[model samples]
Target: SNSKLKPEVVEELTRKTYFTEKEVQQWYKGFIKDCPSGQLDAAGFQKIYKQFFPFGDPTKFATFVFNVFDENKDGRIEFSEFIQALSVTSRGTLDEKLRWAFKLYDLDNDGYITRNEMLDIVDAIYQMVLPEEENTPEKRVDRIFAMMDKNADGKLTLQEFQEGSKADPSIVQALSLYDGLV
Candidate 1:
């Protein structure tokens, strides 16, 4: 069946990502078992997210993550797209990881992250994780902007986000929570 992994696919993925051929095959086995159709839609992805974080609501956060994973904007995630993103978060350099994180916050894919976008993402994270201490998404975004928004333009470019996150371990830690999930 076409369900089996293609050797060329394994070779290309190994070259493009940090995964070895064996690792890619292992992940393909799991991916096909779970997805079966070789494509994952938003709802199906959200179900997996719910199972991972049963303590809180993952709907909003899952949507954002799913959107990021759906690279071609086809409203579906293919195996290549899934593993590529997974590779970045799992094995990418710090700058590479921050770039991916920046994409998540840049909801419009406009090459810049606006305040509203950051707020929405922060709010989604808060809702998904359900932090014990009282904290507002506004304050969180404000804090991030205050530290990272060097231009004071209420938007963050990739450089600003990467450099700022690199300087602040807490910011990196906050964003790294879901890295291992994929």
Candidate 2:
């Protein structure tokens, strides 16, 4: 009970689990700059979120995220509240990125992650990111997948892989958002 991961051990864990530099720099403002008390109201958070995803409707997406996190409907999620919200809604799955959160949430001696635990994280992220707004959800989803599908292939490919490698790669593809990321 006493022994646990030290603070520095978290650097690697954070790297493995959380935002990329681009994602950090881009989204950090929502938490630090826009939010009052550095956390902000649900509306405030949605405004910032919609800024990144040009095609999505902010209101619907915000509703989804808030519905997920605002379990009690208080309408204001603190920084801890927000992170916990994400962790519960999106943790554990095929996506290593999502599953990484499992380690953080499985704080007890138990070895297995419960279905409820997984749903919590997924619900939170859906609330944070998903927008049911008219055409925006469809457009943004299409754009996100379009960005990932470099070769425009139905599936990922070797050429797509190399092209994708440039998180900041000089070589441009059909939707090389690396330039945008920078």
Candidate 3:
């Protein structure tokens, strides 16, 4: 939480987590500026998300990511939720970040990445950020599914995605565009 942290408290928090005192202060400053009331409303969140993707009016992915960060399902994001998300995405270990990315792609939370979910994510990303060359969404989705589904199963297990990421870390960044969080 970006609450008013005393020096000792900041140091202790820094020691426990990945943040330094100065880093906490800077983050707290922005938190306060955005949510003086100590919380971010859905509107405020979507607005900030749009700042990163100004074109195509990307509320589809923004709303999904905002909901995930909201954590409590309470329609607002408190500092705890904000800092937790930032920590995991920005400073947590590779596994944590990769898991977070996996959760984003697993739209239905059915414990597997189905073809439709992968296709939908790709389509959404392509919609907001167009590809450089001509390629039908179908073809792109097919290509990714073939590469990611190592066992030849129709759905992708978490292990498959993890192994695929290990083979090619760039895939993580590329697929993360669907979440609009990275």
Candidate 4:
């Protein structure tokens, strides 16, 4: 009943993706060993969050991130989903990473990031180990939305987000914390 990938499945996944079969196997083993049911439960994920931030609590930020990545909405993350997300977060190109970031920000599964979603995500981000008070008009999420939403449509498109990141790499650094996690 172990749902972890078989050797052949790892081979197939490696053939279709950048990861090697051996790498896939290793990740699969580690993930399954961590959670014997072969899927990451919310509690297991919370343990990982604690490991990531030993000095301070990261549950709030981690909860938001977990909800975003829990693709199936079944409250458990399967191996296939975890490995694919690892690929994107660990080694995907700039465009891919930016797109993933957009997905993370786009709460409610809407294709576009509404103002409320943007604000909510921004607040969660700053809640995770950032300056207590950086009172700069330019640093506000509203300012960032104005910079990204070129068409003034009140929602941000992928192109708008990509261009905005290209214009300001700081946004990329601030928005996506995948580098450290991976």
Candidate 5:
């Protein structure tokens, strides 16, 4: 028989995430199986991201996503952080997912997403999935801001991001790459 997750850890994960006790244990099995150290580093994460996009470079975008998962700025992702992120991406409500995504785009943790930050992320995404596309990140960001900025302030607050994304399926589709990471 396999070793079991601690009762407290399982209970906490069950409460905090959409997964049930059985499901959380299943995930724990896989997580420990893949990462015996019980932590995932940036390079390991990038490797996982690369598997999802075999034809293009996923490094830049992976870095951004990894940073968000790290949570404590400790440069490593623990089981709890990893599972929480996975739950948010896989089964979270729209508001839950968007709130998590806002943290991804708000690279500086400054409570708002600046244009440059969005550009960097969008460019990284384009490089990963559409490396040869004629559409430029600059133009894409321009359109996103035009549609979502709402106040001409050049930065997107979480409310604006949520409302705009909720209103536009294209925006949700464009940002959905993170959904595949989990």
Candidate 6:
């Protein structure tokens, strides 16, 4: 039963320290195509931290994540805070995941992860997933934003993402559906 888990399931598992390092890393690499391994301070945290906000610095990543959990701007990330921070896109507890994802992907926090951004990210993953296949702008990730944006607000927030994701669990399978694109 456990062996039949899906890729996203594995991610949630590893994210929670359920799967072995090898299992998690192997599964994670499929989407995080070029992610380096944790050697010193941990390649994962460092790489994700550095890449998530290309315009920002590592300290910024720490601050952002900390702020994500410190909803009240407290100086500490309590257990509840940590769980809240870790809460991410998935069928299970999707509400929390959607919010974080909206915060994570909506880089500009403009209330939407624009169709351009949505495709860009999906395109990144498509290339990684199918390097042998010819990939072009036309073949980039599909703009499924409308299908997900149930409120017709023309924008996406954690609630919208979760509401949209409620019907589909696979979207949250990887941190970046685009494989390695941040």
Ranking of models by lDDT: 5, 1, 4, 3, 6, 2
What lDDT is reached at residue 1 by model 2?
21
lDDT of each: 0.87, 0.44, 0.74, 0.75, 0.88, 0.48
State the lDDT of candidate 2 residue by residue for 82-171, as single tens digits: 544544344422233223333432223154333343344444444444245424434533443355456454443433433343442332
Arrange candidates by TM-score, descending.
1, 5, 4, 3, 6, 2
Model 3 lDDT, full chain set: 0.74
Q: What are the per-residue Cα lDDT tens digits for candidate 1 across 1-182?
A: 55567778888999999888888888888888999899999999999989988999999999999999999989999999999998987877766788889899999989999999999999999889835333888888888999899999999999998888977977666556444542
How good is model 2 by TM-score? 0.34
lDDT of 4 by residue, 21-42 (tens): 8788878878877888877877
Instruction: State candidate 3's TM-score.
Output: 0.79
Highest TM-score: give the candidate number: 1
Can you tell me which runs of candidate 2 are displaced by over 4 Å?
Answer: 1-30, 89-182
Lowest-sum lDDT 10-residue window in model 5: 173-182
Error of 3 at 95 (Å): 1.9
Candidate closer to the true structure by TM-score (higher is better), 2 or 3: 3
Report the CA-based lDDT of candidate 2 relative to the real structure: 0.44
Error of 2 at 62 (Å): 2.0
- Predicted candidate 6: what Cα RMSD to the true structure? 11.7
Q: Which lDDT value does model 4 have at 9? A: 81
The per-residue C-alpha lDDT of model 1 at residue 124 equals 93
> How good is model 5 by TM-score?
0.89
* Model 4 residue pairs with clashes: none
Residue 155: error of model 3 in Å? 1.5
lDDT of 3 by residue, 27-145 (tens): 77789877888778888887886787788666777766777787788998876677767777777666777788778778878889888887777677666553644366678777777
What is the C-alpha lDDT profile of model 6 across 49-154, one tens digit per residue? 5565555446534444444555455454433333334434222243444567566556555877766655544554333333533355334333356457666655
Better of 4 and 5 by lDDT: 5
